[PDB]
Design a protein around this motif. Structure first.
Motif, PDB file in Angstrom:
ATOM      1  N   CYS A 162       1.275   4.081  -2.984  1.00 22.79           N
ATOM      2  CA  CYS A 162       0.921   5.451  -2.538  1.00 22.79           C
ATOM      3  C   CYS A 162       2.134   6.375  -2.649  1.00 22.79           C
ATOM      4  O   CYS A 162       1.945   7.565  -2.925  1.00 22.79           O
ATOM      5  CB  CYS A 162       0.407   5.401  -1.111  1.00 22.79           C
ATOM      6  SG  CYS A 162      -1.108   4.426  -0.952  1.00 22.79           S
ATOM      7  N   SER A 171     -10.409   2.161  -4.930  1.00 26.75           N
ATOM      8  CA  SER A 171     -10.762   2.757  -3.618  1.00 26.75           C
ATOM      9  C   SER A 171     -10.432   4.253  -3.600  1.00 26.75           C
ATOM     10  O   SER A 171     -11.331   5.045  -3.325  1.00 26.75           O
ATOM     11  CB  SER A 171     -10.068   2.042  -2.513  1.00 26.75           C
ATOM     12  OG  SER A 171     -10.350   2.649  -1.265  1.00 26.75           O
ATOM     13  N   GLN A 187      -3.720  -5.542  -7.094  1.00 28.21           N
ATOM     14  CA  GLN A 187      -3.715  -4.677  -5.919  1.00 28.21           C
ATOM     15  C   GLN A 187      -3.681  -3.209  -6.321  1.00 28.21           C
ATOM     16  O   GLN A 187      -4.368  -2.376  -5.723  1.00 28.21           O
ATOM     17  CB  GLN A 187      -2.540  -5.031  -5.005  1.00 28.21           C
ATOM     18  CG  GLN A 187      -2.735  -6.356  -4.279  1.00 28.21           C
ATOM     19  CD  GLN A 187      -1.782  -6.555  -3.118  1.00 28.21           C
ATOM     20  OE1 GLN A 187      -0.568  -6.608  -3.302  1.00 28.21           O
ATOM     21  NE2 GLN A 187      -2.325  -6.652  -1.912  1.00 28.21           N
ATOM     22  N   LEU A 246      -6.760  -0.811  -5.280  1.00 35.00           N
ATOM     23  CA  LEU A 246      -6.463   0.329  -4.424  1.00 35.00           C
ATOM     24  C   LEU A 246      -6.737   1.646  -5.141  1.00 35.00           C
ATOM     25  O   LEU A 246      -7.206   2.606  -4.520  1.00 35.00           O
ATOM     26  CB  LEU A 246      -5.016   0.248  -3.942  1.00 35.00           C
ATOM     27  CG  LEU A 246      -4.529   1.357  -3.016  1.00 35.00           C
ATOM     28  CD1 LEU A 246      -5.211   1.255  -1.666  1.00 35.00           C
ATOM     29  CD2 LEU A 246      -3.027   1.276  -2.850  1.00 35.00           C
ATOM     30  N   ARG A 273       0.822  -1.204   0.000  1.00 36.40           N
ATOM     31  CA  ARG A 273       0.000   0.000   0.000  1.00 36.40           C
ATOM     32  C   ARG A 273       0.858   1.257   0.000  1.00 36.40           C
ATOM     33  O   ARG A 273       0.680   2.138  -0.851  1.00 36.40           O
ATOM     34  CB  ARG A 273      -0.943  -0.003   1.205  1.00 36.40           C
ATOM     35  CG  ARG A 273      -1.552   1.356   1.491  1.00 36.40           C
ATOM     36  CD  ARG A 273      -2.583   1.302   2.604  1.00 36.40           C
ATOM     37  NE  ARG A 273      -3.569   0.247   2.410  1.00 36.40           N
ATOM     38  CZ  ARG A 273      -4.815   0.460   2.010  1.00 36.40           C
ATOM     39  NH1 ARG A 273      -5.250   1.676   1.725  1.00 36.40           N
ATOM     40  NH2 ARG A 273      -5.646  -0.571   1.897  1.00 36.40           N
TER      41      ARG A 273
END
Ligand SMILES: [Mg+2]
Ligand SMILES: [Zn+2]
Ligand SMILES: [Zn+2]
Lengths: 118, 64, 103, 211, 55, 83
Positions: free
Chosen positions: F12, F48, F41, F45, F8
């Motif tokens: 990011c 989201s 992923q 992500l 993550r």
């Protein structure tokens, strides 16, 4: 200016990451020779809990800060949602927040480090 | 019927159920071996089963 | 000058490619460099034939699409400096100029 | 590393067809008319033709740099080997894609189709096209679909001069009742300077010098 | 082990391994010259790709 | 979905570094072309971060294109612990 006011250094530590919360992990955070402080909450009922954690912290040499109100221990350790400004947080109760690595923002850490020294 | 899903076995405070720091004094006294694997640390307890020493983080095993 | 320069030019259009080639061979003949070219390679005809219907109904009608690639080769004898000084004019879009130094 | 001359021209064509699609979907409400790829020796300069050339640039050129970096990573260019410019479409009235998108947004809002199509026709003819045609197909008013043509001026349909004189676009409006189709065909005038329209006069057109 | 039985069939070849680069449909796919477009999608983008109909 | 903190923070950091992200519709790429996270992923992500307005998403020719928004440059700088 000390003790209670030093939740801020752990705020910064949570920001920069390093709060190894909970006993299951606390131990691991210790034996992995990465523990630096180990705030506790005397509110815990099970005596074997406190005996065991003090035993592990005595095995190594890092530190032990006691603090009451395990609910507040959850609050300081980020075990909650910030919610609004009033913080109507559904707080989870914590009883060990190993500050592995530790926030590197310093400041109060030095003052608590003094209390850490004694 | 509907095949049910495996649910994580929940043992209250297994870390308390791990070390034996008692009899006053100061003896951590682990009660399960710490897996030898280097990456696996020293707080990584190799579970023991009716005949095998199994590390959960990896797979190192020992039967008897 | 000294070395041997092969400039390969390719394009999908004849007029742009030919006027670029004319510019190159004109520049070569102004700087007194001997030029062998332009040499026109056989035109490549890329062909796609497909059923125009997006389904399988109707008269089976076929559209034949073509892309025509035109290749031009220019062979100068010179040094790299004059070659990149010549092949620095406005090369029109679609024309692929390619310079290769030979012995 | 060695790529055929066939594989290479097919790759340039596919790259052009994909870039224009992603720009059409991205710079939709910016008036995107078309993209002019230009592979210079240092970098593959990419010129974007639009109507809102301050909406594609963005605040201090943030959007244009975002697109330039997305194209560089997605298409695998060398870093600083691609630079997306953004020019002004000279005559929006003589562009069928600009008018197709203008009529798209003039109908997404809710304006009556019979009043926006004639407005598009009006603007095109004042711009200077020799003839213009608009087709609206779909569930316009009722459940059964019908097609309303809006033609004014002179329009050729057959032969080679069509692919020199007819600027055409086809765009969908994604409405509440379904999809509405827009075919805009703009017939250009013969421009001796080759800017407003074709430079070649229509084959049947004959001019006799007066004695 | 679910990751070794998920997408575990080989996709080295077959029609269910190549997809349209514009839509992902695997039918009527033109692999010639490396186009990798389906028949319908190529017929729509052919002008952009640079294929002109002369005959 | 369940995405490790490593992965993550990985996706990011790249998004804040460049401000943009892309992927192909391929839920089994097993490795994003830039980020050492598989395409699944990254795609999930990014979906989201988009339902939260933290990015804009355009899909074209079987490829995703995400652009960080002004709210995204705030939430990422808060999340990545550093400006
Ligand atoms: Mg005829
Ligand atoms: Zn292990
Ligand atoms: Zn397709």
């Amino acid at each position: 200016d000390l003790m209670t006011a030093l939740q801020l250094v752990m705020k910064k530590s949570s920001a920069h990451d390093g709060l190894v919360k909970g006993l299951r992990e606390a131990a691991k955070a210790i034996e992995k020779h990465a523990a630096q402080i180990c705030v506790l909450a005397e509110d815990c009922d099970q005596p074997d809990y406190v005996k065991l954690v003090k035993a592990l912290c005595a095995e190594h040499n890092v530190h032990l800060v006691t603090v009451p109100s395990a609910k507040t221990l959850g609050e300081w350790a980020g075990l909650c949602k910030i919610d609004s400004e009033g913080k109507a947080r559904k707080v989870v109760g914590c009883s060990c927040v190993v500050v592995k690595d530790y926030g590197e923002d310093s400041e109060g850490l030095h003052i608590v480090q003094e209390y850490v020294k004694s | 019927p509907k095949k049910q899903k495996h649910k994580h076995k929940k043992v209250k405070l297994a870390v308390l159920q791990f070390y034996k720091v008692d009899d006053a004094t100061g003896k951590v006294t682990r009660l399960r071996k710490e897996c030898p694997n280097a990456d696996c640390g020293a707080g990584t307890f190799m579970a023991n089963h009716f005949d095998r020493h199994y590390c959960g983080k990896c797979g190192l095993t020992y039967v008897y | 000058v000294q070395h041997r320069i092969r400039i390969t030019l390719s394009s999908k259009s004849v007029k742009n490619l030919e006027k670029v080639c004319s510019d190159l061979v004109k520049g070569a003949k102004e700087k007194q460099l001997k030029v062998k070219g332009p040499v026109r390679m056989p035109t490549k005809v890329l062909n796609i034939t497909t059923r125009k219907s997006p389904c399988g109904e109707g008269t089976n009608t076929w559209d034949r699409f073509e892309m025509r690639v035109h290749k031009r080769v220019i062979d100068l004898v010179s040094s790299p400096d004059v070659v990149k000084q010549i092949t620095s004019i406005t090369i029109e879009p679609g024309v692929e100029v390619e310079v290769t130094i030979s012995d | 590393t060695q790529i055929s001359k066939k594989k290479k021209f097919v790759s340039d064509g596919v790259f052009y067809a994909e870039l224009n699609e992603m720009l059409t979907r991205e710079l939709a409400e910016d008036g995107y008319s078309g993209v002019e790829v230009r592979v210079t020796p240092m970098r593959t300069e990419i010129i974007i033709r639009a109507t809102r050339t301050q909406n594609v640039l963005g605040e201090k050129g943030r959007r244009i740099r975002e697109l330039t970096s997305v194209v560089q990573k997605r298409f695998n260019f060398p870093e600083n080997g691609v630079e997306l410019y953004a020019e002004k479409v000279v005559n929006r009235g003589l562009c069928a894609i600009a008018q197709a998108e203008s009529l798209r947004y003039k109908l997404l809002g809710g304006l009556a189709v019979r009043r926006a199509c004639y407005g598009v026709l009006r603007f095109v003819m004042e711009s200077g096209a020799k003839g213009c045609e608009v087709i609206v197909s779909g569930k316009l008013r009722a459940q059964r679909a019908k097609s309303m043509k809006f033609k004014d001026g002179y329009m050729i349909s057959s032969g080679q001069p069509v692919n020199e004189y007819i600027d055409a676009a086809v765009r969908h409006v994604l409405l509440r009742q379904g999809v509405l189709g827009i075919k805009v065909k703009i017939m250009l005038d013969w421009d001796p300077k080759g800017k407003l329209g074709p430079t070649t006069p229509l084959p049947d057109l004959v001019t006799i010098h007066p004695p | 082990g679910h990751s070794n039985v998920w997408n575990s069939h080989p996709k080295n070849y077959g029609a269910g391994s190549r997809v349209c680069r514009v839509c992902g449909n695997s039918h009527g796919l033109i692999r010639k010259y490396g186009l990798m477009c389906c028949r319908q999608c190529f017929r729509s983008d052919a002008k952009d790709i640079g294929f002109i109909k002369y005959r | 979905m369940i995405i490790s903190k490593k992965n993550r923070n990985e996706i990011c950091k790249y998004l804040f570094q460049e401000g943009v992200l892309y992927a192909k519709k391929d839920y089994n790429l097993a490795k994003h072309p830039q980020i050492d996270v598989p395409n699944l992923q990254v795609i999930k992500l990014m979906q989201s971060f988009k339902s939260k307005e933290y990015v804009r998403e355009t899909f074209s020719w079987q490829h995703y294109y995400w652009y960080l928004t002004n709210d995204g440059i705030e939430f990422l700088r808060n999340f990545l612990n550093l400006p």
